[PDB]
Structures are given as structure tokens and as C-alpha cells.
């Protein structure tokens, strides 16, 4: 679950066990130095354009 | 002298594939060897000798089966050796084809 609040990247993941959705709290991945992220690490590439 | 036989496609009539130490090793291989009986007369017989190439505990052994006068001969197991001895680890028989050996 990728989200962008105030230009900042947050994510949460779900684990499902035959219909047991275990939700995780929203988390903030950061780069090696820090400063967290400015855009979502996800690109949708198509035949026409990305 | 060593002799390179040529075993016809129909002459190879038995073979066996068994793993030892996790390896493709051929354990049994039997092929027919054809010949013509040598008598003073002029009739041509057609007498066959069957060779049983066997590999036990990584050692190559050999027998020949002969057939005459209503019986089936068996000869002693022999272990052919190299000029340096040490017998053998692989049966000296190769089967080839279009796909692979």
C-alpha cells in the first residue's frame, strides 16, 4: 500500500492467511543518508508512455 | 593389441543404469557377437557368443557365454587391466546415436 502525504512516501503491508488480513502500521522508509523519500518508488511503464 | 569392435545396433540387447555416489554409471551391458564356425568342411554355421560387461563396486568385469551341443557355457569372471594395472573404473563400451552418447 503506497501512499504520498505532504510529498512524503509512506507504506503499509498486509498479510493474508486464508482470509486473515493482518495490517501493519504506516511506515516511512528512508535513503541511506536519510531525508526519507520525495516520490513513491514505483513506475508504471507502458507501450505509450510511463 | 587392443581392438575396437563395432557392435551392430540390433546386437546391443541389454543395458542397465544405476547411480553410485550420485553418478550416472552403467552397471550391466550385454551384446551379441556373431561369427562363423571354423571346420574343415564348407557348410557355414552361424554361432553366437554373448558378452556380459558388468561393473561391480567401480570395477569392470567380463564374461563370455558360449553355446554348443545343447548347453550354455559360462566362463570365469575376469578383470581386464591397463598396462599400468589398476584395472578399470568404467565399462569400455560406448553407445552413440543421433541425439547423444
Amino acid at each position: 500500500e503506497l501512499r504520498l502525504v505532504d510529498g512524503t512516501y509512506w507504506q503499509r503491508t498486509w498479510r493474508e492467511n486464508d482470509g486473515q488480513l493482518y495490517v501493519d502500521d504506516w511506515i516511512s522508509p528512508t535513503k541511506a543518508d536519510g531525508s526519507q523519500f520525495d516520490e513513491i518508488p514505483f513506475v508504471i511503464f507502458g507501450s505509450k508512455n510511463n | 593389441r587392443p581392438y575396437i569392435k563395432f557392435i551392430a545396433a540390433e546386437d546391443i540387447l541389454n543395458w542397465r543404469e544405476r547411480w553410485v555416489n550420485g553418478a550416472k554409471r552403467t552397471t550391466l551391458l550385454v551384446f551379441r557377437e556373431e561369427s562363423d564356425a571354423d571346420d574343415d568342411g564348407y557348410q557355414i554355421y552361424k554361432e553366437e557368443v554373448w558378452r556380459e560387461l558388468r561393473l561391480v563396486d567401480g570395477t569392470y568385469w567380463q564374461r563370455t557365454w558360449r553355446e554348443n551341443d545343447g548347453q550354455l557355457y559360462v566362463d570365469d569372471w575376469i578383470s581386464p587391466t591397463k598396462a599400468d594395472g589398476s584395472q578399470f573404473d568404467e565399462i569400455p563400451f560406448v553407445i552413440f546415436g543421433s541425439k547423444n552418447n
Partner: protein, 53 residues
């Protein structure tokens, strides 16, 4: 007392079968060509050959 003890005897499977009785390994060559063995194919019930009498 061996009666109180338990005895299991023993068993094994030799995976061996008796083949047959009479001698049949005289067929070709042993009879000096009297009886021979080929791998020819024939159909119907009969094969002919003509030899000019």
C-alpha cells in the same frame, strides 16, 4: 524361561523365481545349424517359395 520371552523367527524376500524345467538352450548353433533362429516377418498363415523341381 523361554516361554515368557518372545520369539519372532525370521523372514526374507529373495525376489527369485524358478524359470522352467527342460533344457531349451540348444536351439541355434548348439545343434550345429539344425535348428536356426531369425527375425523375419510373415503374415496371413503361410509363406511360399518355388524351386523348379
Amino acid at each position: 524361561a523361554l516361554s515368557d520371552l518372545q520369539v519372532f523367527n525370521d523372514w526374507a524376500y529373495k525376489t527369485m523365481s524358478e524359470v522352467l524345467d527342460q533344457q531349451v538352450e540348444l536351439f541355434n548353433g548348439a545343434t550345429r545349424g539344425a535348428i536356426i533362429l531369425r527375425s523375419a516377418g510373415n503374415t496371413g498363415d503361410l509363406s511360399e517359395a518355388a524351386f523348379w523341381a
